Amino acid sequence: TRYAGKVVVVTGGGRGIGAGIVRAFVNSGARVVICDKDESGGRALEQELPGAVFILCDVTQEDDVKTLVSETIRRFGRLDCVVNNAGHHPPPQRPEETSAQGFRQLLELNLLGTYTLTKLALPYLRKSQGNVINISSLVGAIGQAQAVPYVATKGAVTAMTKALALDESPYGVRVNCISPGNIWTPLWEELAALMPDPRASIREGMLAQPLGRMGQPAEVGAAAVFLASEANFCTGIELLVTGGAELGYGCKAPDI
Amino acid sequence: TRYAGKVVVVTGGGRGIGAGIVRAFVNSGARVVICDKDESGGRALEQELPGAVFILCDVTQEDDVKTLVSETIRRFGRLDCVVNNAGHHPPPQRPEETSAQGFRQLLELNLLGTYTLTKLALPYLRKSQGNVINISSLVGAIGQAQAVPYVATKGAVTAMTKALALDESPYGVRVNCISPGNIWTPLWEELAALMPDPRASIREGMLAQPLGRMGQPAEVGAAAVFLASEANFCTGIELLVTGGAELGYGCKAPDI
Amino acid sequence: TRYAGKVVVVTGGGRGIGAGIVRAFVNSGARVVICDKDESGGRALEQELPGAVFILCDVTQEDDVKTLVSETIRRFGRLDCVVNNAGHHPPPQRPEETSAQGFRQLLELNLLGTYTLTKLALPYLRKSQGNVINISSLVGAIGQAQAVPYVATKGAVTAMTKALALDESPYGVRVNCISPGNIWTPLWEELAALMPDPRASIREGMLAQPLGRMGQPAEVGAAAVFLASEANFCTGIELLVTGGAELGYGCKAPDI
Amino acid sequence: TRYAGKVVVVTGGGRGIGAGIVRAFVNSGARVVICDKDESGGRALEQELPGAVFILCDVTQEDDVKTLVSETIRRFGRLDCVVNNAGHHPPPQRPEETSAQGFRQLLELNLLGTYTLTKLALPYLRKSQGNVINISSLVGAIGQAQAVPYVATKGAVTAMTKALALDESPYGVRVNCISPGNIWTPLWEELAALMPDPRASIREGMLAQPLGRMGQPAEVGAAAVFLASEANFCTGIELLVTGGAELGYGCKAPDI
Ligand SMILES: NC(=O)c1ccc[n+]([C@@H]2O[C@H](COP(=O)([O-])OP(=O)(O)OC[C@H]3O[C@@H](n4cnc5c(N)ncnc54)[C@H](O)[C@@H]3O)[C@@H](O)[C@H]2O)c1
Ligand SMILES: NC(=O)c1ccc[n+]([C@@H]2O[C@H](COP(=O)([O-])OP(=O)(O)OC[C@H]3O[C@@H](n4cnc5c(N)ncnc54)[C@H](O)[C@@H]3O)[C@@H](O)[C@H]2O)c1
Ligand SMILES: NC(=O)c1ccc[n+]([C@@H]2O[C@H](COP(=O)([O-])OP(=O)(O)OC[C@H]3O[C@@H](n4cnc5c(N)ncnc54)[C@H](O)[C@@H]3O)[C@@H](O)[C@H]2O)c1
Ligand SMILES: NC(=O)c1ccc[n+]([C@@H]2O[C@H](COP(=O)([O-])OP(=O)(O)OC[C@H]3O[C@@H](n4cnc5c(N)ncnc54)[C@H](O)[C@@H]3O)[C@@H](O)[C@H]2O)c1
Ligand SMILES: OC[C@H]1O[C@@H](O)[C@H](O)[C@@H](O)[C@@H]1O
Ligand SMILES: OC[C@H]1O[C@@H](O)[C@H](O)[C@@H](O)[C@@H]1O
Ligand SMILES: OC[C@H]1O[C@@H](O)[C@H](O)[C@@H](O)[C@@H]1O
Ligand SMILES: OC[C@H]1O[C@@H](O)[C@H](O)[C@@H](O)[C@@H]1O
Ligand SMILES: O=[N+]([O-])c1ccc(F)c(O)c1
Ligand SMILES: O=[N+]([O-])c1ccc(F)c(O)c1
Ligand SMILES: O=[N+]([O-])c1ccc(F)c(O)c1
Ligand SMILES: O=[N+]([O-])c1ccc(F)c(O)c1
Ligand code: NA
Ligand code: NA
């Protein structure tokens, strides 16, 4: 009952972190709209979870997003929280292997889709004194190798979260982000499968955390439910869900 | 039931933020040991809350703290979480008005008391795969005027939290801190009463946050219960509970 | 002679911070290519400074940038440092007053122009073991009101700086950024002139810093010359040139 | 001539980073007072460098420090910059192997010695509009394993730098810190010699940086001369001299 009577939209909620967030909010008592560009996972999740429904929506298509918001209000009568989770990490790319156009396309998903849904949702979030939760990444803060466009998009999301928090504070609408580190998801598994030694790639990812394991979608979901339901004095924060990967010295490569 | 069956020690739990944390953990189903050097508030809290008991303990006295831990284990059989909240903010002091000995005394409360309880508790936290929550302050991160010793003690607590998180990660013990901003507590009220215009001092403190109000002990308490019960992939983090005070430009004082 | 024999490109170098950086590098002994989309300031700077030449170049036009790099190599035989300073801050815009297309256009200047020049310059910077300096902004780190797109672009630049630093570290090429706060420039003056009370707007900007004044282009220039010439163990850093604006509590707007 | 006519005190200046800072300031044209508790290195440095003199001074002894300041003024007539570099890193210590009294002793050197010299110097720095530079450490910011007391002392120094910057800003006195990462110094070499495999310990320290090497005292010295002589709009900053050790993922230890 922590978030009972509330209505939540989760983008990219059909699998991975997004599905973990969907499950966490349903378990808290909320009704959840699962937005995803792929039907497979999200439609099955709707059948599985009574408090969840699936709406096909590509967050890069402004008309898809307009319909997502108007259908949410038409079907459920209010909107309390938007979780902007949809996003993609390309395979490793050296800087000279990137393109401006590929950079533009990744900005369209990771940044502008978050911007567009947030903009269309804010009039309703103001009425409900709701909140926005953006899923950024630890690598926006500390960088990552072979990922210049991806890192840039998440640096933008984290910064945008703080700007929006300032703008919406007089209306009682909080805007926060979660920065996960290595979370074991289908995207992580897909990316490891492209590596010469997938098992070695996965073990390296596990040992990047002092805790010695990757995180779970359910753990990101619990952080999201906290930010929505119990963090009434938090706005503009970056909640790290990383297992301590940012702590201490590690292998990143006597004084010349 | 979020933290049912667990045993929590809260230092400085007799009033203010500490009492808000005590209440939050009792509401989550935990048994709570209220530690405080003053009997008045903590003893009344024990009478009020069934899941809470009061143990008189000055965290600067190592033998008081040894007895706090051994009495907790004797009476409740386990220890799952230590919340190091005891601490003090002196009245405003210009740098030339501080002393090394006053600095040493503030380090004894704000830093070494946290260190001592954590050290004595860790053998039991390892057995329970428990966790440590230190109450630091936003001003450890961003500074504050007329508070050189206080700011230094909280910078130490936040850093120490990260070091300890690294050391205890192989044992499954998480170590995190909460950095509150302006929280309306008896200490805040006492400090404002020393000012020429207390009402103006309080209004200034309220407007230091984009949210336009100070925070509540219950809001710090909810963050603590989150870190203890649902943040299993968080260690070494600094959870800001500040109402956005660190965001954007403000009045802190054309190019010469 | 701190940077004698070296060749530096400064984008947006015709006025403001960029011109201050141009002057600082000329004073250090470097030859400087002034890139700007406007002829007026940059052409006069070339006439004024013996070690500087002006090349008309719009950093959003990839063919302009290709020609900028090839002309620099043709005329001076090497390239040691690229300072990505070109960028724009729109007038204050409430979130609901922004557009995706306006956001895209600002990303094109503030982020992708920096990306494009850096990409085209890196083969030559590798040969010279040169370095990249991006001019970001403090508001990428802490947020700003009525500037969601601008803040997002600078969050991206700061993050991208760290990603690129990781990628180029094995080649000995350092990548750093400077985050200025309020610097008194023609852009600042233009923006204040749009306000109801320009003088009040300027005084507010001055008092946003504990130092009680805004910064100078020459001060950003000195930081850039430091990063280029004497910071051989710095890569991926964010050098704050802000007068302390990020420090302490301020006016950003008792516990409800 | 960048800092000609100025007078600088460097504590712990007899070897290591401190000696590199002494050399950098002498090369900039300043007169330097070398403070150290050991005579060997500092006395030889005075003989070697015309613009430098050695004063025996233990920064934990308040009367030593009073005499250091009064002798500096008596001999040179002004004081422009204090570099608080004296400090120590103990050998690796597990948390349960530390003591409160050992923690107190390390606070006395790393934190209170910096506090005491700064306090005694500030009246003269106000007259000269001088500045303070504290040598902290990257591990104050990100933590380190087996170093709870050391990490806590450097977290305190970095925070104290920001508090003091706020307090002294109305007097035109800037207060900044440098946070080095792995710098190859006699302390680093001594600590590695205690390890089972010193060569393996040194190689691990080198590879903790994306640049693949440790830093040099001269590189910390150049950062200090920058902060003193050319960073007039920087106060309360933490200048990282770390070779990028804080960037990206590394080895710090699939989802359980
Ligand atoms: N997995 C990690 O380690 C990790 C770490 C940090 C941040 N993140 C972020 O978390 C989020 C989710 O990552 P994940 O690992 O769960 O990925 P994932 O690929 O497993 O799942 C992403 C989901 O989003 C959907 N999606 C993609 N593009 C979409 C679009 N245009 N419109 C609507 N839905 C779309 C996909 O169909 C999928 O269901 C992303 O923003 C990612 O950047 C992930
Ligand atoms: N109030 C704020 O705005 C604020 C902001 C940031 C951080 N904090 C921190 O939160 C904590 C609590 O602050 P507060 O405002 O609730 O203060 P408070 O003075 O209202 O309550 C502190 C409690 O700790 C107890 N205590 C003090 N010294 C003790 C000792 N030696 N041993 C045991 N108990 C002791 C006091 O008796 C009291 O019950 C402190 O660590 C403080 O630095 C407060
Ligand atoms: N002024 C401040 O307070 C401040 C603070 C933080 C960051 N910054 C950043 O510093 C940089 C310079 O700011 P400023 O105040 O000097 O601005 P400015 O407007 O005074 O000068 C910017 C210069 O860049 C040029 N320019 C603009 N678009 C260009 C393009 N497409 N191609 C080439 N040149 C182009 C302009 O013609 C001008 O000469 C920007 O990146 C800005 O975001 C400024
Ligand atoms: N070496 C590194 O990798 C590294 C990294 C980050 C920070 N630091 C910091 O840099 C500073 C210097 O470190 P280092 O590696 O050069 O150490 P070092 O041991 O090589 O040199 C320190 C110097 O300070 C002197 N000193 C020690 N205690 C003193 C006291 N009480 N009074 C006066 N002088 C005293 C010593 O005699 C010595 O000459 C310290 O503050 C250290 O914490 C070092
Ligand atoms: O595909 C890798 C992992 O992705 C997560 O989203 C799922 O919850 C797991 O079942 C799966 O092991
Ligand atoms: O004393 C100021 C405030 O302190 C808080 O700890 C209490 O919960 C409030 O009742 C009180 O208004
Ligand atoms: O236009 C405001 C300021 O802009 C700076 O770039 C110039 O150096 C100054 O001459 C001018 O006062
Ligand atoms: O002792 C290790 C290193 O310490 C530095 O301070 C010295 O400048 C070097 O000569 C030496 O290699
Ligand atoms: O830190 N990240 O953002 C991140 C890490 C690993 C992944 F596989 C991923 O898709 C995203
Ligand atoms: O930010 N703080 O740590 C803080 C702020 C105000 C107070 F009254 C106080 O006691 C502590
Ligand atoms: O912090 N900035 O990025 C910033 C501040 C003020 C300006 F006028 C400006 O053009 C940019
Ligand atoms: O990061 N440090 O503070 C640090 C690292 C290595 C050392 F040997 C040392 O004495 C200090
Ligand atoms: Na359903
Ligand atoms: Na009770």
Ligand code: NA
């Ligand atoms: Na010229």
Ligand code: NA
């Ligand atoms: Na000499």
